[PDB]
PDB file of C-alpha atoms and ligand atoms in Angstrom:
ATOM      1  CA  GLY Z   1     -27.063 -18.160  11.741  1.00 45.75           C
ATOM      2  CA  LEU Z   2     -24.477 -20.211  10.034  1.00 48.40           C
ATOM      3  CA  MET Z   3     -25.365 -18.321   6.847  1.00 47.91           C
ATOM      4  CA  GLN Z   4     -21.908 -16.073   6.499  1.00 48.99           C
ATOM      5  CA  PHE Z   5     -21.774 -13.816   3.382  1.00 43.70           C
ATOM      6  CA  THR Z   6     -17.919 -14.017   1.244  1.00 41.46           C
ATOM      7  CA  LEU Z   7     -16.951 -11.811  -1.331  1.00 40.09           C
ATOM      8  CA  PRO Z   8     -14.505 -12.755  -4.060  1.00 40.84           C
ATOM      9  CA  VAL Z   9     -10.876 -12.413  -2.736  1.00 38.85           C
ATOM     10  CA  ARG Z  10     -10.466  -8.910  -4.544  1.00 41.08           C
ATOM     11  CA  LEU Z  11     -13.241  -7.409  -2.910  1.00 42.14           C
ATOM     12  CA  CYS Z  12     -12.615  -9.425   0.615  1.00 39.79           C
ATOM     13  CA  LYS Z  13      -9.288  -7.287   0.781  1.00 37.49           C
ATOM     14  CA  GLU Z  14     -10.028  -4.436  -0.587  1.00 35.50           C
ATOM     15  CA  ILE Z  15     -13.220  -3.558   1.080  1.00 34.79           C
ATOM     16  CA  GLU Z  16     -11.031  -2.725   4.815  1.00 36.18           C
ATOM     17  CA  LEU Z  17      -9.591  -0.388   2.922  1.00 37.27           C
ATOM     18  CA  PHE Z  18     -10.833   3.511   3.471  1.00 41.30           C
ATOM     19  CA  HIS Z  19     -10.188   4.083  -0.454  1.00 43.53           C
ATOM     20  CA  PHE Z  20     -12.568   0.955  -1.733  1.00 45.68           C
ATOM     21  CA  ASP Z  21     -14.654   1.867  -4.426  1.00 45.29           C
ATOM     22  CA  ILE Z  22     -18.008  -0.346  -4.300  1.00 43.19           C
ATOM     23  CA  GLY Z  23     -18.006  -1.086  -7.969  1.00 43.89           C
ATOM     24  CA  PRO Z  24     -20.606  -0.379 -10.541  1.00 47.73           C
ATOM     25  CA  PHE Z  25     -22.812  -3.391  -9.931  1.00 46.49           C
ATOM     26  CA  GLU Z  26     -25.605  -2.516  -8.206  1.00 45.26           C
ATOM     27  CA  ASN Z  27     -27.308  -5.610  -7.729  1.00 45.95           C
ATOM     28  CA  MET Z  28     -23.700  -6.309  -5.248  1.00 44.11           C
ATOM     29  CA  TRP Z  29     -24.302  -3.513  -3.137  1.00 46.40           C
ATOM     30  CA  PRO Z  30     -26.312  -4.682  -0.462  1.00 47.61           C
ATOM     31  CA  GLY Z  31     -24.164  -8.318  -0.187  1.00 50.12           C
ATOM     32  CA  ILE Z  32     -21.542  -5.339   0.408  1.00 47.67           C
ATOM     33  CA  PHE Z  33     -23.174  -4.002   2.973  1.00 47.93           C
ATOM     34  CA  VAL Z  34     -24.597  -6.682   4.777  1.00 46.05           C
ATOM     35  CA  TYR Z  35     -20.748  -8.135   5.009  1.00 44.16           C
ATOM     36  CA  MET Z  36     -19.857  -5.030   6.637  1.00 44.04           C
ATOM     37  CA  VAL Z  37     -22.187  -5.597   9.207  1.00 46.56           C
ATOM     38  CA  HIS Z  38     -21.272  -8.918   9.638  1.00 46.64           C
ATOM     39  CA  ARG Z  39     -17.857  -8.174  10.486  1.00 46.64           C
ATOM     40  CA  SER Z  40     -18.244  -4.229  12.086  1.00 49.87           C
ATOM     41  CA  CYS Z  41     -21.463  -6.074  14.058  1.00 49.46           C
ATOM     42  CA  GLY Z  42     -22.122  -9.830  14.603  1.00 49.15           C
ATOM     43  CA  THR Z  43     -23.741 -12.155  12.824  1.00 50.25           C
ATOM     44  CA  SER Z  44     -26.141 -11.781  15.507  1.00 50.42           C
ATOM     45  CA  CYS Z  45     -27.241  -7.957  15.228  1.00 46.24           C
ATOM     46  CA  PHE Z  46     -29.762  -7.823  12.969  1.00 49.70           C
ATOM     47  CA  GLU Z  47     -32.499 -11.058  11.920  1.00 49.81           C
ATOM     48  CA  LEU Z  48     -30.321 -11.463   8.346  1.00 50.57           C
ATOM     49  CA  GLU Z  49     -34.538 -11.340   6.717  1.00 49.58           C
ATOM     50  CA  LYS Z  50     -35.522  -8.094   8.410  1.00 46.49           C
ATOM     51  CA  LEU Z  51     -31.815  -6.551   7.510  1.00 46.28           C
ATOM     52  CA  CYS Z  52     -32.695  -7.522   4.011  1.00 50.09           C
ATOM     53  CA  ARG Z  53     -36.475  -6.175   3.956  1.00 52.36           C
ATOM     54  CA  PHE Z  54     -34.661  -2.909   5.606  1.00 50.11           C
ATOM     55  CA  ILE Z  55     -31.835  -2.707   2.479  1.00 53.12           C
ATOM     56  CA  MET Z  56     -34.284  -3.172  -0.231  1.00 55.06           C
ATOM     57  CA  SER Z  57     -36.878  -0.492   1.044  1.00 55.14           C
ATOM     58  CA  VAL Z  58     -34.106   2.351   1.758  1.00 56.58           C
ATOM     59  CA  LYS Z  59     -32.992   0.972  -1.891  1.00 54.90           C
ATOM     60  CA  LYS Z  60     -36.140   1.727  -3.165  1.00 52.15           C
ATOM     61  CA  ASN Z  61     -36.465   5.601  -1.361  1.00 48.76           C
ATOM     62  CA  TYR Z  62     -33.595   6.828  -2.924  1.00 51.16           C
ATOM     63  CA  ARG Z  63     -33.990   8.515  -6.129  1.00 51.05           C
ATOM     64  CA  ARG Z  64     -32.437   8.055  -9.664  1.00 53.05           C
ATOM     65  CA  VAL Z  65     -30.269  11.687  -9.254  1.00 53.54           C
ATOM     66  CA  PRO Z  66     -26.628  11.980  -9.915  1.00 54.63           C
ATOM     67  CA  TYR Z  67     -25.200  11.867  -6.740  1.00 56.17           C
ATOM     68  CA  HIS Z  68     -27.515  12.012  -3.721  1.00 59.54           C
ATOM     69  CA  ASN Z  69     -28.419   8.377  -4.827  1.00 59.62           C
ATOM     70  CA  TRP Z  70     -28.438   4.550  -3.867  1.00 60.83           C
ATOM     71  CA  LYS Z  71     -24.345   4.288  -4.553  1.00 61.95           C
ATOM     72  CA  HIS Z  72     -23.580   7.483  -2.023  1.00 61.75           C
ATOM     73  CA  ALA Z  73     -25.850   5.736   0.536  1.00 63.11           C
ATOM     74  CA  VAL Z  74     -23.355   2.565   0.172  1.00 65.86           C
ATOM     75  CA  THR Z  75     -20.464   4.303  -0.283  1.00 70.67           C
ATOM     76  CA  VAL Z  76     -20.889   6.518   3.422  1.00 74.76           C
ATOM     77  CA  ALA Z  77     -22.017   3.202   4.731  1.00 76.16           C
ATOM     78  CA  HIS Z  78     -18.294   1.600   3.958  1.00 77.05           C
ATOM     79  CA  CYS Z  79     -16.474   4.406   5.059  1.00 78.18           C
ATOM     80  CA  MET Z  80     -18.219   4.099   8.569  1.00 75.60           C
ATOM     81  CA  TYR Z  81     -17.187   0.170   8.101  1.00 73.24           C
ATOM     82  CA  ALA Z  82     -13.297   1.288   7.687  1.00 71.23           C
ATOM     83  CA  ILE Z  83     -13.761   4.031  10.307  1.00 70.70           C
ATOM     84  CA  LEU Z  84     -15.226   1.580  13.027  1.00 73.17           C
ATOM     85  CA  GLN Z  85     -13.035  -1.496  11.762  1.00 78.33           C
ATOM     86  CA  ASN Z  86      -9.734   0.641  12.588  1.00 78.23           C
ATOM     87  CA  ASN Z  87     -11.045   1.766  16.028  1.00 79.90           C
ATOM     88  CA  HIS Z  88     -12.763  -1.691  17.410  1.00 79.68           C
ATOM     89  CA  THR Z  89     -12.360  -1.279  20.983  1.00 81.41           C
ATOM     90  CA  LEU Z  90     -13.240   2.673  21.345  1.00 81.24           C
ATOM     91  CA  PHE Z  91     -16.931   2.103  20.160  1.00 80.08           C
ATOM     92  CA  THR Z  92     -20.490   0.456  21.556  1.00 81.90           C
ATOM     93  CA  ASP Z  93     -22.400  -2.626  20.410  1.00 80.60           C
ATOM     94  CA  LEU Z  94     -25.514  -0.037  19.936  1.00 79.53           C
ATOM     95  CA  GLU Z  95     -23.064   2.647  18.344  1.00 74.12           C
ATOM     96  CA  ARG Z  96     -21.843   0.170  15.330  1.00 77.58           C
ATOM     97  CA  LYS Z  97     -25.608  -1.267  14.739  1.00 77.90           C
ATOM     98  CA  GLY Z  98     -26.210   2.010  14.530  1.00 77.46           C
ATOM     99  CA  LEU Z  99     -23.978   4.216  12.657  1.00 77.88           C
ATOM    100  CA  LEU Z 100     -23.804   1.695   9.839  1.00 76.82           C
ATOM    101  CA  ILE Z 101     -27.663   2.475   9.637  1.00 77.48           C
ATOM    102  CA  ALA Z 102     -27.438   6.102  10.477  1.00 77.06           C
ATOM    103  CA  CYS Z 103     -24.758   6.080   7.035  1.00 78.58           C
ATOM    104  CA  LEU Z 104     -27.171   4.101   4.928  1.00 78.58           C
ATOM    105  CA  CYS Z 105     -30.368   6.287   5.744  1.00 77.40           C
ATOM    106  CA  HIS Z 106     -28.536   9.506   5.791  1.00 75.08           C
ATOM    107  CA  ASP Z 107     -29.820  11.148   2.415  1.00 72.32           C
ATOM    108  CA  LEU Z 108     -32.641   8.970   1.945  1.00 73.80           C
ATOM    109  CA  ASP Z 109     -35.378  10.471  -0.744  1.00 74.43           C
ATOM    110  CA  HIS Z 110     -32.686  13.567  -1.382  1.00 75.80           C
ATOM    111  CA  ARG Z 111     -33.922  15.062  -4.945  1.00 72.67           C
ATOM    112  CA  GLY Z 112     -30.494  16.795  -5.261  1.00 71.89           C
ATOM    113  CA  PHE Z 113     -31.146  19.777  -3.995  1.00 72.31           C
ATOM    114  CA  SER Z 114     -29.461  22.440  -1.208  1.00 72.27           C
ATOM    115  CA  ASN Z 115     -31.319  23.442   1.821  1.00 71.05           C
ATOM    116  CA  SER Z 116     -31.092  26.452   0.623  1.00 73.81           C
ATOM    117  CA  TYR Z 117     -32.572  25.673  -2.485  1.00 74.04           C
ATOM    118  CA  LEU Z 118     -35.911  24.601  -0.487  1.00 77.52           C
ATOM    119  CA  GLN Z 119     -36.499  27.840   1.561  1.00 77.05           C
ATOM    120  CA  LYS Z 120     -35.679  29.991  -1.946  1.00 77.11           C
ATOM    121  CA  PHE Z 121     -38.071  27.552  -4.065  1.00 76.45           C
ATOM    122  CA  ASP Z 122     -40.676  28.046  -0.122  1.00 78.49           C
ATOM    123  CA  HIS Z 123     -40.642  23.963  -0.382  1.00 77.97           C
ATOM    124  CA  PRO Z 124     -43.128  22.200   2.202  1.00 77.06           C
ATOM    125  CA  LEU Z 125     -40.339  20.806   4.127  1.00 78.40           C
ATOM    126  CA  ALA Z 126     -38.389  24.495   4.739  1.00 79.74           C
ATOM    127  CA  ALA Z 127     -41.848  25.132   6.540  1.00 84.43           C
ATOM    128  CA  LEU Z 128     -42.393  22.105   8.751  1.00 85.09           C
ATOM    129  CA  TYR Z 129     -37.728  21.945   9.268  1.00 88.69           C
ATOM    130  CA  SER Z 130     -36.797  25.813   9.312  1.00 91.31           C
ATOM    131  CA  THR Z 131     -33.084  24.522   9.829  1.00 92.78           C
ATOM    132  CA  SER Z 132     -31.101  21.109   8.363  1.00 93.73           C
ATOM    133  CA  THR Z 133     -34.119  20.680   6.090  1.00 92.89           C
ATOM    134  CA  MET Z 134     -33.241  17.652   4.217  1.00 91.22           C
ATOM    135  CA  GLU Z 135     -31.546  15.830   7.104  1.00 91.02           C
ATOM    136  CA  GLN Z 136     -34.370  15.813   9.172  1.00 89.19           C
ATOM    137  CA  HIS Z 137     -36.555  14.661   6.142  1.00 88.45           C
ATOM    138  CA  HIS Z 138     -34.156  11.818   6.183  1.00 87.08           C
ATOM    139  CA  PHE Z 139     -34.040  10.752   9.893  1.00 90.56           C
ATOM    140  CA  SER Z 140     -38.328  11.352   9.101  1.00 90.15           C
ATOM    141  CA  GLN Z 141     -37.668   8.676   6.227  1.00 89.62           C
ATOM    142  CA  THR Z 142     -35.860   6.571   8.423  1.00 91.60           C
ATOM    143  CA  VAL Z 143     -38.141   5.841  11.060  1.00 91.05           C
ATOM    144  CA  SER Z 144     -41.037   5.426   9.170  1.00 92.41           C
ATOM    145  CA  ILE Z 145     -39.100   2.713   6.944  1.00 90.66           C
ATOM    146  CA  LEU Z 146     -38.400   1.356  10.274  1.00 92.12           C
ATOM    147  CA  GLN Z 147     -42.029   1.025  11.031  1.00 90.44           C
ATOM    148  CA  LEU Z 148     -43.087  -1.039   7.946  1.00 92.77           C
ATOM    149  CA  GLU Z 149     -44.110  -4.096   8.874  1.00 92.13           C
ATOM    150  CA  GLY Z 150     -41.906  -6.815   8.953  1.00 90.12           C
ATOM    151  CA  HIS Z 151     -39.028  -3.748   8.529  1.00 89.16           C
ATOM    152  CA  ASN Z 152     -37.960  -3.398  12.419  1.00 90.46           C
ATOM    153  CA  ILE Z 153     -34.282  -4.339  12.141  1.00 91.23           C
ATOM    154  CA  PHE Z 154     -34.054  -3.354  16.493  1.00 89.49           C
ATOM    155  CA  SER Z 155     -36.990  -5.561  17.623  1.00 88.16           C
ATOM    156  CA  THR Z 156     -34.442  -7.586  20.018  1.00 90.75           C
ATOM    157  CA  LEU Z 157     -33.352  -4.278  21.483  1.00 93.69           C
ATOM    158  CA  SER Z 158     -34.918  -3.479  25.301  1.00 93.48           C
ATOM    159  CA  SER Z 159     -37.074  -0.517  24.982  1.00 91.62           C
ATOM    160  CA  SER Z 160     -34.188   2.073  26.364  1.00 88.51           C
ATOM    161  CA  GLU Z 161     -31.702  -0.065  24.102  1.00 89.14           C
ATOM    162  CA  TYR Z 162     -34.425   0.977  20.820  1.00 91.25           C
ATOM    163  CA  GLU Z 163     -34.667   4.471  21.906  1.00 92.40           C
ATOM    164  CA  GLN Z 164     -30.317   5.153  22.721  1.00 90.09           C
ATOM    165  CA  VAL Z 165     -30.044   3.817  18.884  1.00 90.30           C
ATOM    166  CA  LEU Z 166     -32.707   5.811  17.471  1.00 90.47           C
ATOM    167  CA  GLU Z 167     -31.346   9.193  18.787  1.00 89.95           C
ATOM    168  CA  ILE Z 168     -27.572   7.644  17.487  1.00 87.81           C
ATOM    169  CA  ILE Z 169     -28.863   7.947  14.689  1.00 86.35           C
ATOM    170  CA  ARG Z 170     -30.666  10.950  14.530  1.00 90.10           C
ATOM    171  CA  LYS Z 171     -27.573  12.976  15.515  1.00 89.91           C
ATOM    172  CA  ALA Z 172     -26.089  11.331  13.441  1.00 91.17           C
ATOM    173  CA  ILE Z 173     -28.144  11.905  10.107  1.00 91.43           C
ATOM    174  CA  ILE Z 174     -28.224  15.385  11.587  1.00 89.85           C
ATOM    175  CA  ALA Z 175     -24.499  16.335  11.754  1.00 88.82           C
ATOM    176  CA  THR Z 176     -24.310  15.120   7.659  1.00 89.84           C
ATOM    177  CA  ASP Z 177     -25.938  19.336   7.423  1.00 91.55           C
ATOM    178  CA  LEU Z 178     -22.269  20.791   6.423  1.00 92.29           C
ATOM    179  CA  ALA Z 179     -23.566  24.114   7.754  1.00 95.10           C
ATOM    180  CA  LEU Z 180     -23.258  21.934  11.312  1.00 92.87           C
ATOM    181  CA  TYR Z 181     -19.766  20.718  10.407  1.00 91.25           C
ATOM    182  CA  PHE Z 182     -17.592  24.029  10.744  1.00 88.19           C
ATOM    183  CA  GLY Z 183     -18.894  25.084  14.533  1.00 89.07           C
ATOM    184  CA  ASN Z 184     -18.373  21.055  15.225  1.00 92.10           C
ATOM    185  CA  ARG Z 185     -15.171  20.657  14.300  1.00 89.05           C
ATOM    186  CA  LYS Z 186     -14.270  23.836  15.377  1.00 86.70           C
ATOM    187  CA  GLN Z 187     -15.300  23.095  19.346  1.00 85.06           C
ATOM    188  CA  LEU Z 188     -13.465  19.424  18.681  1.00 87.42           C
ATOM    189  CA  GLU Z 189     -10.542  21.397  17.911  1.00 88.50           C
ATOM    190  CA  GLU Z 190     -10.414  23.412  21.315  1.00 90.86           C
ATOM    191  CA  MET Z 191     -11.112  20.629  23.263  1.00 93.86           C
ATOM    192  CA  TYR Z 192      -8.350  18.325  21.741  1.00 94.98           C
ATOM    193  CA  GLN Z 193      -5.545  21.002  22.377  1.00 94.11           C
ATOM    194  CA  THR Z 194      -6.288  22.299  25.278  1.00 94.60           C
ATOM    195  CA  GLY Z 195      -6.959  18.419  26.606  1.00 94.41           C
ATOM    196  CA  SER Z 196     -10.579  18.253  27.355  1.00 95.54           C
ATOM    197  CA  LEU Z 197     -11.678  15.909  24.782  1.00 98.55           C
ATOM    198  CA  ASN Z 198     -12.689  13.023  26.983  1.00100.00           C
ATOM    199  CA  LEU Z 199     -14.536  10.111  25.159  1.00 97.86           C
ATOM    200  CA  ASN Z 200     -16.789   9.060  28.698  1.00 99.60           C
ATOM    201  CA  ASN Z 201     -18.638  12.597  28.027  1.00 96.15           C
ATOM    202  CA  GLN Z 202     -21.973  11.811  25.855  1.00 96.16           C
ATOM    203  CA  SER Z 203     -21.852  15.181  24.381  1.00 97.05           C
ATOM    204  CA  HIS Z 204     -18.423  14.988  23.649  1.00101.43           C
ATOM    205  CA  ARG Z 205     -18.509  11.323  21.723  1.00105.70           C
ATOM    206  CA  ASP Z 206     -21.246  12.816  20.097  1.00102.61           C
ATOM    207  CA  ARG Z 207     -19.531  15.339  18.265  1.00101.66           C
ATOM    208  CA  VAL Z 208     -16.875  12.807  17.355  1.00102.44           C
ATOM    209  CA  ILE Z 209     -19.438  10.592  15.961  1.00105.36           C
ATOM    210  CA  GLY Z 210     -20.621  13.802  14.470  1.00103.14           C
ATOM    211  CA  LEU Z 211     -17.294  14.556  12.933  1.00103.16           C
ATOM    212  CA  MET Z 212     -16.872  10.589  11.404  1.00101.41           C
ATOM    213  CA  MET Z 213     -20.457  10.952   9.559  1.00100.03           C
ATOM    214  CA  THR Z 214     -18.965  15.092   8.020  1.00101.96           C
ATOM    215  CA  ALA Z 215     -16.231  12.228   7.625  1.00102.51           C
ATOM    216  CA  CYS Z 216     -17.943   9.178   5.869  1.00101.97           C
ATOM    217  CA  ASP Z 217     -20.160  11.567   3.556  1.00101.43           C
ATOM    218  CA  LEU Z 218     -17.405  13.676   2.119  1.00103.88           C
ATOM    219  CA  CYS Z 219     -14.583  10.085   1.926  1.00104.54           C
ATOM    220  CA  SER Z 220     -15.331  10.816  -2.312  1.00104.32           C
ATOM    221  CA  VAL Z 221     -12.873  13.537  -1.939  1.00106.41           C
ATOM    222  CA  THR Z 222     -10.491  10.189  -0.101  1.00106.60           C
ATOM    223  CA  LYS Z 223     -10.770   8.023  -2.869  1.00105.94           C
ATOM    224  CA  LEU Z 224      -7.966   7.289  -5.970  1.00104.33           C
ATOM    225  CA  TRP Z 225      -7.469   9.935  -8.107  1.00100.22           C
ATOM    226  CA  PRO Z 226      -9.751   8.667 -11.572  1.00 99.44           C
ATOM    227  CA  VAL Z 227     -12.975   7.850  -8.705  1.00 97.38           C
ATOM    228  CA  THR Z 228     -12.476  11.427  -6.702  1.00 97.12           C
ATOM    229  CA  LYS Z 229     -12.406  12.899 -10.432  1.00 97.71           C
ATOM    230  CA  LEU Z 230     -15.318  11.060 -11.629  1.00 99.89           C
ATOM    231  CA  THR Z 231     -17.416  11.709  -8.776  1.00 97.46           C
ATOM    232  CA  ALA Z 232     -16.599  15.306  -8.819  1.00102.31           C
ATOM    233  CA  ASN Z 233     -18.726  15.224 -12.368  1.00100.84           C
ATOM    234  CA  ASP Z 234     -21.958  13.961 -10.531  1.00100.81           C
ATOM    235  CA  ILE Z 235     -21.740  16.211  -7.486  1.00101.67           C
ATOM    236  CA  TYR Z 236     -21.241  19.364  -9.812  1.00102.85           C
ATOM    237  CA  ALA Z 237     -24.550  18.107 -12.018  1.00103.27           C
ATOM    238  CA  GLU Z 238     -26.631  18.659  -9.406  1.00101.14           C
ATOM    239  CA  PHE Z 239     -24.833  21.705  -8.457  1.00101.48           C
ATOM    240  CA  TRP Z 240     -25.447  23.023 -12.256  1.00100.31           C
ATOM    241  CA  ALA Z 241     -29.356  21.603 -12.327  1.00 99.31           C
ATOM    242  CA  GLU Z 242     -29.534  23.275  -8.827  1.00100.73           C
ATOM    243  CA  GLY Z 243     -28.179  26.516 -10.309  1.00103.35           C
ATOM    244  CA  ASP Z 244     -30.240  26.416 -13.567  1.00100.66           C
ATOM    245  CA  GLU Z 245     -33.553  26.251 -10.356  1.00103.26           C
ATOM    246  CA  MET Z 246     -32.000  28.951  -9.012  1.00101.34           C
ATOM    247  CA  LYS Z 247     -31.944  31.246 -12.116  1.00100.77           C
ATOM    248  CA  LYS Z 248     -35.811  29.754 -13.130  1.00102.26           C
ATOM    249  CA  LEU Z 249     -36.491  31.525  -9.657  1.00101.91           C
ATOM    250  CA  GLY Z 250     -34.652  34.874 -11.250  1.00100.44           C
ATOM    251  CA  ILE Z 251     -31.295  34.501  -8.504  1.00101.07           C
ATOM    252  CA  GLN Z 252     -28.153  34.392 -10.221  1.00102.32           C
ATOM    253  CA  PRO Z 253     -26.509  31.214  -8.706  1.00100.00           C
ATOM    254  CA  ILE Z 254     -22.797  31.231  -6.546  1.00 97.36           C
ATOM    255  CA  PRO Z 255     -20.416  30.128  -9.343  1.00 98.18           C
ATOM    256  CA  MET Z 256     -19.806  26.843  -7.656  1.00 97.92           C
ATOM    257  CA  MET Z 257     -23.746  25.661  -9.112  1.00 96.50           C
ATOM    258  CA  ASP Z 258     -23.489  27.655 -12.339  1.00 95.96           C
ATOM    259  CA  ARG Z 259     -22.645  25.818 -15.523  1.00 95.32           C
ATOM    260  CA  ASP Z 260     -21.568  28.937 -17.428  1.00 92.55           C
ATOM    261  CA  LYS Z 261     -18.568  28.810 -14.834  1.00 92.01           C
ATOM    262  CA  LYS Z 262     -17.397  24.926 -15.636  1.00 94.28           C
ATOM    263  CA  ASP Z 263     -13.704  26.571 -15.713  1.00 95.01           C
ATOM    264  CA  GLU Z 264     -13.712  27.983 -12.292  1.00 93.86           C
ATOM    265  CA  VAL Z 265     -14.540  24.385 -10.601  1.00 94.19           C
ATOM    266  CA  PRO Z 266     -11.009  23.386 -10.076  1.00 92.25           C
ATOM    267  CA  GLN Z 267     -10.267  26.667  -7.976  1.00 95.43           C
ATOM    268  CA  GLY Z 268     -13.682  25.715  -6.683  1.00 99.05           C
ATOM    269  CA  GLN Z 269     -12.478  22.012  -5.196  1.00 96.35           C
ATOM    270  CA  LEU Z 270      -9.100  24.072  -4.106  1.00 96.22           C
ATOM    271  CA  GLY Z 271     -11.357  26.143  -1.599  1.00 93.66           C
ATOM    272  CA  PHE Z 272     -13.475  23.506  -0.935  1.00 97.22           C
ATOM    273  CA  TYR Z 273     -10.303  20.776  -0.200  1.00 97.46           C
ATOM    274  CA  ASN Z 274      -9.078  23.847   1.849  1.00 95.42           C
ATOM    275  CA  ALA Z 275     -11.625  25.011   3.694  1.00 92.71           C
ATOM    276  CA  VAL Z 276     -13.490  21.756   4.749  1.00 93.33           C
ATOM    277  CA  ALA Z 277     -12.354  18.374   3.636  1.00 94.98           C
ATOM    278  CA  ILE Z 278      -8.507  18.772   5.042  1.00 93.65           C
ATOM    279  CA  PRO Z 279      -9.519  20.234   8.192  1.00 91.58           C
ATOM    280  CA  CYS Z 280     -12.526  17.213   8.574  1.00 88.09           C
ATOM    281  CA  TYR Z 281      -9.480  14.532   8.379  1.00 87.27           C
ATOM    282  CA  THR Z 282      -7.027  16.627  10.487  1.00 89.26           C
ATOM    283  CA  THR Z 283      -9.348  16.813  13.458  1.00 86.27           C
ATOM    284  CA  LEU Z 284     -10.650  13.390  12.851  1.00 87.78           C
ATOM    285  CA  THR Z 285      -7.084  11.866  12.213  1.00 91.36           C
ATOM    286  CA  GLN Z 286      -5.771  13.421  15.793  1.00 91.14           C
ATOM    287  CA  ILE Z 287      -9.415  12.362  17.517  1.00 93.66           C
ATOM    288  CA  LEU Z 288      -9.213   8.863  15.624  1.00 90.92           C
ATOM    289  CA  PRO Z 289      -5.354   8.510  14.749  1.00 92.84           C
ATOM    290  CA  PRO Z 290      -6.318   5.406  12.708  1.00 88.09           C
ATOM    291  CA  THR Z 291      -7.885   6.954   9.904  1.00 88.04           C
ATOM    292  CA  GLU Z 292      -5.101   9.196   8.748  1.00 87.17           C
ATOM    293  CA  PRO Z 293      -5.261   7.282   5.319  1.00 88.88           C
ATOM    294  CA  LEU Z 294      -8.302   9.644   4.708  1.00 88.64           C
ATOM    295  CA  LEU Z 295      -6.233  12.931   5.352  1.00 89.25           C
ATOM    296  CA  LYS Z 296      -3.199  11.177   3.506  1.00 86.35           C
ATOM    297  CA  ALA Z 297      -5.775  10.283   0.366  1.00 84.57           C
ATOM    298  CA  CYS Z 298      -7.269  13.599   0.976  1.00 83.50           C
ATOM    299  CA  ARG Z 299      -4.015  15.949   0.916  1.00 80.66           C
ATOM    300  CA  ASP Z 300      -2.655  13.554  -2.658  1.00 81.03           C
ATOM    301  CA  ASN Z 301      -6.185  14.581  -4.311  1.00 77.78           C
ATOM    302  CA  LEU Z 302      -5.984  18.207  -3.067  1.00 76.61           C
ATOM    303  CA  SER Z 303      -2.206  17.498  -4.986  1.00 78.72           C
ATOM    304  CA  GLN Z 304      -4.229  16.082  -7.881  1.00 76.35           C
ATOM    305  CA  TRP Z 305      -6.681  19.524  -8.216  1.00 77.29           C
ATOM    306  CA  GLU Z 306      -3.103  21.804  -8.039  1.00 79.19           C
ATOM    307  CA  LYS Z 307      -2.210  20.137 -11.112  1.00 79.10           C
ATOM    308  CA  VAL Z 308      -5.121  20.351 -13.036  1.00 81.12           C
ATOM    309  CA  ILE Z 309      -5.126  24.396 -12.417  1.00 83.00           C
ATOM    310  CA  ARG Z 310      -1.445  24.369 -13.628  1.00 78.19           C
ATOM    311  CA  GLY Z 311      -2.201  22.619 -16.838  1.00 79.96           C
ATOM    312  CA  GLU Z 312      -0.289  19.104 -16.606  1.00 79.39           C
ATOM    313  CA  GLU Z 313      -3.843  17.574 -16.867  1.00 79.04           C
TER     314      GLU Z 313
HETATM  315  C1  LIG T 401     -20.420  22.908  -2.267  1.00 79.30           C
HETATM  316  N1  LIG T 401     -19.748  21.102  -1.786  1.00 79.30           N
HETATM  317  C2  LIG T 401     -20.665  20.315  -0.830  1.00 79.30           C
HETATM  318  N2  LIG T 401     -21.803  21.492   0.381  1.00 79.30           N
HETATM  319  N3  LIG T 401     -20.291  19.268  -0.848  1.00 79.30           N
HETATM  320  C3  LIG T 401     -18.970  18.902  -1.497  1.00 79.30           C
HETATM  321  C4  LIG T 401     -18.442  18.040  -1.594  1.00 79.30           C
HETATM  322  C5  LIG T 401     -18.776  16.454  -1.204  1.00 79.30           C
HETATM  323  C6  LIG T 401     -18.204  15.344  -1.392  1.00 79.30           C
HETATM  324  C7  LIG T 401     -17.004  15.623  -2.937  1.00 79.30           C
HETATM  325  N4  LIG T 401     -16.910  16.753  -3.106  1.00 79.30           N
HETATM  326  C8  LIG T 401     -17.516  17.959  -3.055  1.00 79.30           C
HETATM  327  C9  LIG T 401     -17.159  18.828  -3.882  1.00 79.30           C
HETATM  328  C10 LIG T 401     -17.608  20.017  -3.332  1.00 79.30           C
HETATM  329  C11 LIG T 401     -18.953  19.887  -2.143  1.00 79.30           C
HETATM  330 MG1  LIG T 402     -27.431  14.634   2.543  1.00 77.57          MG
HETATM  331 ZN1  LIG T 403     -24.462  12.467   1.942  1.00 74.70          ZN
END
């Protein structure tokens, strides 16, 4: 109980900021996550011995892919930590417990391929889960790891609290399916504007938690330019591999995923910032005012991408 994790001074200060980069030392990421849980939740939330065992199984079930990896898991959980810390009073005890675990687990056992490629490949997972294929797999993997012996970090919860937290986790992981984001943002938009957005309505909470999950999942677009730019390379290394695999099934891939069309990537980033990122953080800022720094950082990176096209870098 009296065993606080502390970070070196630069990390202690910068981890509070939305734009924090968890760094290149993998050995520090578990401790960074524990520190975030202890400050976001309490030193009481989780029995440390169980949490540390949970974290190491979770790490072991992420794959060595360019982007959808362990570092992404912890980066997404750090964004959730920043939102939750800048919106202290708005979230329940159980939500704070659940959402950092959801974010750490949201891409469990990802192979670096989209739901579309599983469907065209005819992967067993596409037969088992017709929509949000990889996301239902991520939640399935989460439940499996929680049910390993010595891994149930939720044991001190009641039967009802247990079901509520796993329901929070399930909706949260499903919501990272970007196919679901568009409808979810549109409905949050209409609720906020007409003024009917009511945070005591559990269905309205679900929607808001989903937008947060999208915001955290995309947060590589909200980092300082050199981080955002270098993460773009890992992101497109998975897209191009998926494009290669599409051509192998005799399907010309969308240009995004075609490694012959690398010249079209900067224009593709504009589309993505304009169509997905800018609206995502706009709507989130309107619902949760203290997350504005995500919108600001997102807008700055859009400006950096327009500069790449103009030729000035
Ligand atoms: C097509 N596309 C999808 N599905 N996710 C992303 C993305 C996610 C984080 C950062 N940059 C990104 C650029 C393009 C993306
Ligand atoms: Mg995912
Ligand atoms: Zn993700």
